[PDB]
Symmetry: D3
Subunit: 257 residues, 6 copies
């Protein structure tokens, strides 16, 4: 039986919420350039795939994902000046999260996991949550609980980190279109990756400040912030298992049966 | 080569827009109860499937679909009081459409088809377009053109209508979870439909006025506005060809090579 | 004694609301082109006149009408590119309805009828109502009830239709500046109509999609979607009596004395 | 020929704007308690009557009036806690003015007089004007000019002031439902005033600060801020001519042929 | 011990609010041209200094001041076309006031004095207060009380005015960068005033209407609305004691121990 | 001559902008709990002091600081559930930044540095900039440049870090009210720090996700994320010299004479 709310009937959904401890998960992504070697829906595909696996394991349900995210920033995504990247204004993203929470609460749901897959979304997700919880408190509702996370933050194991970043962990911002996402993509959606098109450049470096309008010259030409040359299906499986396991455990701790 | 923008690299997308007469298509759906016999993501699946087939024929590209639409209304969708239905505020939906158009224009695109699959979305799509076009004018851009349509409106042929509705056509609003959508789903995604679960009630009728708060007694208990008892894969195939051909022709007429 | 809230003192108003069953009515119109033969405030004047007559009959009160409505659409009102037509953004109209409901609830009113005179207003009225009811719910208030209706939906009777359209009725979709509105105006405000200026063109027809920016060629030059050549005072008197009786009956059903 | 835009056809309005120096006027009022002796639509009726007469004299046109205004303040209108008073939020009023100016500009109009009739509207009208003009500048339009005024400010002649206020003028802020408005109503709409119902209390005084939530005990019970006992039709006719003469002259100066 | 909240630890502030009758004060100013002889932060500096002194006397606390206010208007501050003046949109200021009240209420505070130092801010402060009180009412809270005042309104005593203006008083509508503010600045921050740079022009006068876009010719060249030639430290010390005494008394009356 | 815009006359400011290469600096802070040993205006005081020193060195001017910032987050500032912390909504902060940029652009300014002192502000600052630049583009202006920096990113050097943290540096994620801010305060405003009140707890650690509503147990009781026990005036003097030099260099690079 599907773990995707979209694939269930309203009766099936109603029954699952009626059970009393139902956990819902919402993938939050983006449509964003991911270099010469990968497609642009990565940030939707990856958190959605992780939510699916986590849900199967813990008996949770997964909502339709947010397909468009906040504006790409040079230091974490190359910059919003690239073609293809299609971004929302902050208020729009915030409002979407807020509306969704309001509705889940109307259903009787009280447990939500927001799984971010696009670096720049985080603070707008946070504001959406706050505004929704504020409204719930107006109606005397104080038992709606949210867990928010970016799936990569769960990859902390030194042993795993050394494999991926043998030469040093580059930070999750510089991990745009690099070894981490590319490996996952090779494991999950190999037809959407062409490792031979990877432009091997040295990891992007930036000064300690930001400039607007964004200066395109400061982003590597391909749009990637680090090279995915050494990405592998094997690395992807390793990441997948570590993320899925860690997130499941975290959700079980925060939302016990 | 995929017709989905999300499955393209940013270079491939850029090249397609650079060619001069590129048509983009954006499906706009909802997560909404669709009776006891069908899942809740129908309004995303159907227009996305029609977009795909149209795009294949005319050489267009399809953007990631809007997964959440405007609040369900009793006379066209059963009402927003149903569990599962997860709806956005008007401002949110309008803002999403507005942000996407702004970004596509930034890319250099000038031709957009918005294919609606959820009855209640229309006027908020219309406002999103108007506000986006207003902004483009401020920026000196007047050559961005938009076609907006709901795919079912292309099923006009009296003969076809009789094949689908032998007892009479009762309006696209009352076609919520009925013969039309169910037939399309049987043709495209049979695993998401269980015809044996259909509740065969008479078509919903309503007084010539609307009441808020929505009174649940005025909607058939299953949430459908009409019975999909006579839905069939064959009917789905017929609808599909009529919609795809009609829309393809309309787009070719509005956006010639 | 006036049925118009604006013509009452606050004490008279307070006492009427104090009765506990007071029905308030809000006309919602537009300032919109209505052909060569009629003035532009039709969509306010007509629902206001109907409200007045209904209120006289059932003991209700009528609020000052909304004079400006949503952007005219080609298929319903000819399009927002015409001179004279002066339209609000959706958020503005939604906010106006929302504010008025908040205030009426503060007064202690709990029964409201919105009478729409301009097709395009519909969904923004719906959103304004939803947002206002949402706020009342935050205050534990759930007994505020709203009925929304368009006066033309009360001319259902085929026998009435036969009298009004002896040469065959071609539908409500083309009744902008046509027989229906012009006849009502001839009955109520004959000095605001000059039937000799009617341009007797064939009914407007459109493809099953819309284009923005709006193409002016698709609207008949005069701005009307159908000819008012056969309009008459007598037809207007009939429409008036039928609309008033039907609406009075519906309101008494939903809001019993 | 009517001076009201709403009573014109779109063709007549188009020709008047095409003339080149067309002045438009927009009355901005409120629905607000005005004591025991007068109705609640005064702030619409009065500036509308003044606009009509000015328009007749200078060849201008008058737009449908704004019927709902900003929240009544204790020191200028008794307070928004009164029944009947139906007020908009500031953003709503601001947006309404903004939308109307944008549309008038679309028509080709470049001259607008905003005539305020409700003391509390002023700064929200100002913001609406500023936001509209900002937008016009974005579209390369800088020749749109607005004159904004509260009609009572044109009563400056000490001789007139003394006829109305022999014991001394205390200000337009405490003139709510008093001699000025009541006199005008006695001259223009005598059936909407009953002088026998005037409660003759001493003029309201207040400390040099404001308190929220508004405290009802600090407002004279009837809602008036001063007594209308000495109001008269003759005084109303004097006020009317002074305002109409002054405003006409002012507009001729600012918007010359 | 400091009377400024910003200079306290959170524990100190918590304890002060915990005592039960804590009065908080919020200065609301602007960055605005104030002629050739005075600096641009006057409207922040002055209410802050008055708040400090009142707080010392009555045991109140002072919040960080609002540094930016609403757009300068010709008749009160010279106009927003001047350099240096840096103004917020109405919605921005309203939202800022609203957010702060929400947060103070969350701390458990229930007594707030807003001290305005910039004429144009008033109605946006009023709206902010209303929207915050509205939200509190959703939670059943009705004991949050706000006193709003412009500090100059406390210089009322004709005996005082006689002392400050012996040759004759010209009114408050011209006191932008004039005798009142300059004298206060001479007493409090003499280094920020150079009386020798005063441009001695006649008091500004205007017709009973406003024009937008603002016409710079209609404001005296230096930006002041009246001459500060006769300003003095002695006058400033008198204004200061009168304002501080008056406001302390008013606050003690509205917020007793 | 002061480097603060607020302390200049409008003429002095105008002349500085007229010079052609004028750099303006805006401190962006917060009112937020900073432990038992320090006051709550730290995030305003610190960037303001750094801006002052940088401005003195490079000939730049400093605008009035933003005193209120975005909601405190558990992992960076302890969380918004603390008393004293007084936070804005995202939209409010974004709008404030947007309005200020629009106004500076109106003045003719084209070079702006935003110095953030409160981590949580970052993305709202980013959105404010983007929205303001978008509007400038509508108005034909493409030469306005913004540099955004957090002063703490300029203490990069490991040799400086070693000097500042001889018992070992644990990272920037726990530097809320710890050694870094406390040392700077001891150097600049020693009366606002009482080192004896420091609670010497073990550095804060958190799981790889966030929870809302915020669980207070997950923040160290005093509100600090690390102990400032070893903070010193001397450390502060070093931080100050290092930050001022680095920021001055960066600005000269990005905005040369
Ligand atoms: Zn990615
Ligand atoms: Zn991304
Ligand atoms: Zn459907
Ligand atoms: Zn639907
Ligand atoms: Zn009409
Ligand atoms: Zn209409
Ligand atoms: Zn009045
Ligand atoms: Zn009024
Ligand atoms: Zn001032
Ligand atoms: Zn000022
Ligand atoms: Zn800090
Ligand atoms: Zn902070």
């Amino acid at each position: 039986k599907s773990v995707f709310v979209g694939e269930l009937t309203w009766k099936e959904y109603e029954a699952r919420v009626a059970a009393g401890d139902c956990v819902l998960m919402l993938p939050v992504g983006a449509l964003e350039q991911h270099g010469h070697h990968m497609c642009m829906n990565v940030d939707v595909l990856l958190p959605t795939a992780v939510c699916k696996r986590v849900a199967e394991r813990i008996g949770a349900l997964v909502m339709p994902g947010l397909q468009y995210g906040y504006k790409s920033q040079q230091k974490s995504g190359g910059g919003n000046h690239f073609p293809g990247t299609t971004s929302l204004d902050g208020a729009t993203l915030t409002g979407t999260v807020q509306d969704i929470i309001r509705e889940l609460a109307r259903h009787g749901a009280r447990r939500l996991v927001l799984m971010n897959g696009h670096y720049e979304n985080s603070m707008f997700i946070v504001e959406g949550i706050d505004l929704a919880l504020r409204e719930l408190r107006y109606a005397g509702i104080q038992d709606f609980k949210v867990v928010v996370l970016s799936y990569w933050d769960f990859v902390k194991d030194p042993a795993v980190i050394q494999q991926l970043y043998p030469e040093g962990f580059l930070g999750w911002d510089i991990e745009h279109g690099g070894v981490f996402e590319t490996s996952l993509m090779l494991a999950l959606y190999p037809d959407l990756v062409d490792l031979d098109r990877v432009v091997d450049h040295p990891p992007a470096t930036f000064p300690p400040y930001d400039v607007f309008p964004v200066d395109p010259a400061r982003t590597p030409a391909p749009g990637t912030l680090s090279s995915a040359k050494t990405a592998s299906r094997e690395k992807g499986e390793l990441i997948l298992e570590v993320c899925v396991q860690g997130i499941a455990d975290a959700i079980r701790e925060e939302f016990p049966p």
